[PDB]
């Protein structure tokens, strides 16, 4: 069976091509830069009101409103500056494990093991939040969802596929296939033409939104990938996984360039994010704390004061002003 | 110091908080259950007798108490991600059929499943209930052969009661961490129509325990 021979030959050839590109590791080149010192961030606003553990949260473009989803069957929109509630949307099911906030602030999204993506309208003339469209094209639990614009959305599911939806007609436009296991991570690029995703098969793949094909494939880890985020420049992205290591990849090189880990951490990684400048990499671990890594020298610059339980999601405002972390305490905390 | 609209926004937030509190109090009395098992095991016969996309959910009430029970059969991937979302369940129901041992081992698979369920990382403090079905047929067909086909060192006489106690201790002995969790057992058949009472006793026990642990500071 020469087909398997061709496959393994191409695998070996890709390895040979990749090993030729490297000439000096990023550690050597960047060793001459001054260290970032110590970065201590103090909790300064605690958002209270959930009754069960929080699964996911997301910011908005205005960097003042956020949306939180909880097991209690509620999707609350907060006002970070004044710790007030603007809406409290009741959900059909209590197994929500994802949420999103449209860039224009007109819609929000919710998903879970109900296998249905619900989009809500916030500026209706009726005066109350009402469901606009419900999408039931998937065959498994939805892990993540992100808005490209008010009429488009990309969702990843456990059926090893990610699909792009035209909200108006409710039909799938393009479908993405190639993953071997459940998909759990997804992040859009600053230029929306591209996006990445993560799976439990220990590989993260790069997609093209409209061409319907994969551009590059990365393996990196040896366990499940649970988080993914784009480096602000749009030419790199970090990944988190169960083996307690974060890894940064470069698109134009199709090769790994840095790994973050220390001998005293063994638990998994739930979320990963960058600062606006891209010099910091905040990762939320399972052991009720989050660490901040100097993204250029791999050193550990500080530790956010821990929650009382696991941190399920972590995000940074578009202006880099604050970092919000959700946990299973039923609380959110803003850091700066 | 606040403006005119800020006060109205604060009032709206307070109203939302009041509604959330009321709904949470309403939802603190709807006990959640989770159904497991290697197969159907005739677990739907309770709902049929009582005649009251995503996953299946059933609702019924009994004695001023609301019951919602879920089914794990809707899983589409490995249970690692499917099971953690049910950490808030009060009790977990597990079913075993007593007439499914000599079918043309399965008992070892059931034992491993029970060990993984009751000793699961996420089910830290969830009481487990055991329902053994098809007792009327099990009593007669034991005469052909005991459970020796899969387990060694069978002890006791041929009386069905002692054998039933042996299997009951066989599943119960998997609770190496009984230091934190309780277990209840009860036999059943397709025509007894009395499971709801045992489920009521179990949920009452779990509710009392949770109230003592959470509010009473015991």
């Amino acid at each position: 069976d020469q087909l398997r021979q061709e496959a393994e030959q191409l695998k070996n050839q890709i390895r040979d091509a990749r090993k030729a590109c490297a000439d000096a590791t990023l550690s050597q080149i960047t060793n001459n830069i001054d260290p970032v010192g110590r970065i201590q961030m103090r909790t300064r606003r605690t958002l209270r009101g959930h009754l069960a553990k929080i699964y996911a949260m997301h910011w908005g473009t205005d960097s003042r409103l956020l949306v939180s989803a909880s097991q209690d069957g509620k999707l609350i929109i907060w006002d970070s500056y004044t710790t007030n509630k603007v809406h409290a949307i009741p959900l059909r099911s209590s197994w929500v494990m994802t949420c999103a906030y449209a860039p224009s602030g007109n819609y929000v999204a919710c998903g879970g093991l109900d296998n249905i993506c619900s989009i809500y309208n916030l500026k209706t003339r009726e005066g109350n939040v009402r469901v606009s469209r419900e999408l039931a094209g998937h065959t498994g639990y939805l892990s993540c969802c992100r808005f490209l614009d008010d009429n488009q959305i990309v969702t990843s599911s456990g059926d090893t596929t990610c699909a792009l939806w035209d909200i108006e007609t409710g039909q799938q436009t393009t479908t993405f296939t190639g993953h071997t296991g459940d998909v759990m991570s997804l992040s859009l690029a600053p230029d929306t033409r591209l996006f990445v995703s993560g799976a439990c098969d220990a590989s993260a793949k790069l997609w093209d939104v409209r061409e319907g094909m994969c551009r590059q494939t990365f393996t990196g880890h040896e366990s499940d990938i649970n988080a993914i985020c784009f480096f602000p420049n749009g030419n790199a992205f970090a990944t988190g996984s169960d083996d307690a290591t974060c890894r940064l990849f470069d698109l134009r090189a199709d090769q790994e360039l840095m790994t973050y880990s220390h001998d005293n951490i063994i638990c998994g990684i739930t979320s990963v994010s960058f600062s606006k400048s891209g010099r910091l990499l905040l990762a939320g671990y399972d052991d009720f704390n989050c660490n901040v890594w100097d993204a250029l020298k791999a050193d550990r610059a500080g530790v956010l004061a821990g929650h009382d339980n696991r941190v399920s999601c972590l995000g940074v405002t578009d202006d880099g002003m604050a970092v919000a972390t959700g946990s299973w305490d039923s609380f959110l905390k803003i850091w700066n | 110091t606040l403006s005119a609209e800020d006060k109205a926004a604060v009032e709206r937030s307070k109203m939302i908080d009041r509604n959330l509190r009321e709904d949470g109090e309403k939802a603190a009395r709807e006990v959640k259950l989770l159904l497991l098992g290697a197969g159907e095991s005739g677990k739907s016969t309770i709902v049929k007798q009582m005649k009251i996309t995503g996953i299946v959910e059933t609702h019924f009430t009994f004695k001023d108490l609301h019951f919602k029970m879920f089914d794990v059969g809707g899983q589409r991937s490995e249970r690692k991600k499917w099971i953690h979302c049910f950490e808030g369940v009060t009790a977990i129901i597990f079913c075993v059929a007593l007439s499914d041992y000599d079918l043309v081992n399965r008992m070892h698979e059931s034992m491993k499943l029970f060990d993984s369920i009751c000793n699961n990382k996420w089910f830290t403090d969830t009481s487990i209930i055991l329902f053994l079905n098809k007792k009327d047929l099990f009593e007669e067909k034991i005469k052909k052969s005991p459970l020796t086909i899969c387990y060694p060192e069978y002890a006791g006489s041929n009386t069905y009661e002692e054998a039933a106690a042996y299997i009951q201790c066989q599943f119960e002995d998997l609770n190496k961490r009984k230091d934190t969790k309780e277990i209840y057992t009860h036999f059943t058949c397709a025509t007894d129509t009395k499971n709801v009472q045992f489920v009521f006793d179990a949920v009452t026990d779990v509710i009392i325990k949770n109230n003592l642990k959470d509010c009473g500071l015991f």
Partner: single-chain antibody
Amino acid sequence: DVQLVESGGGLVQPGGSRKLSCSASGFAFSSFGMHWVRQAPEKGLEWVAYISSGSGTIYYADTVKGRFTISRDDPKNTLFLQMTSLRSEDTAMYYCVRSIYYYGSSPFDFWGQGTTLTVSSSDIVMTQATSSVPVTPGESVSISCRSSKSLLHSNGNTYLYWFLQRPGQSPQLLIYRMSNLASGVPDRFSGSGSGTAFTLTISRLEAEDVGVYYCMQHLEYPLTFGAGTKLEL
């Protein structure tokens, strides 16, 4: 569609009592706090009373307190204004306005058809001069509104509003907080100004938007309205 009708007008002898109600439909009534507004036969508008969601806060005008009372019945979606010991000057047409307050909202977004009531017979002051402004279709014009006390609150918002009352119609919202176009308003209009001087510019006039333009302040109760300026064709 969204409708909001009211009834209870007629002829009332001086010193008597009368009752009028505001029936609302097509929107969540309980989530909106609603106002009452009055208009003299020829003069401008004035603010009467306010009731919030949950009826936890109520306000009145300094010329209304002790006479009127405001209550709401959420289950059947009907407001009420019971007036006692009426006066000759109390004659006016009463509108039934609605407003909701949350970050990014549009208070005073709908006005009722209105009812007519006839009698047998310190605080911010808004100045709006040039009561008459001639204009022709296709020409660009502007109107200036002024406030005695600065409306630039410490939180970065200037609480100013603009309204337009076409002949034989209820007022409609044009600009809220001095820089935001209300839903459904043409992009022709615009608003800008400092903390004490304000202006509204119409880029290109049309015969469909002729009327009286008012400016209202929402920094601290009671609310105040300008004298209104007419545009004549």
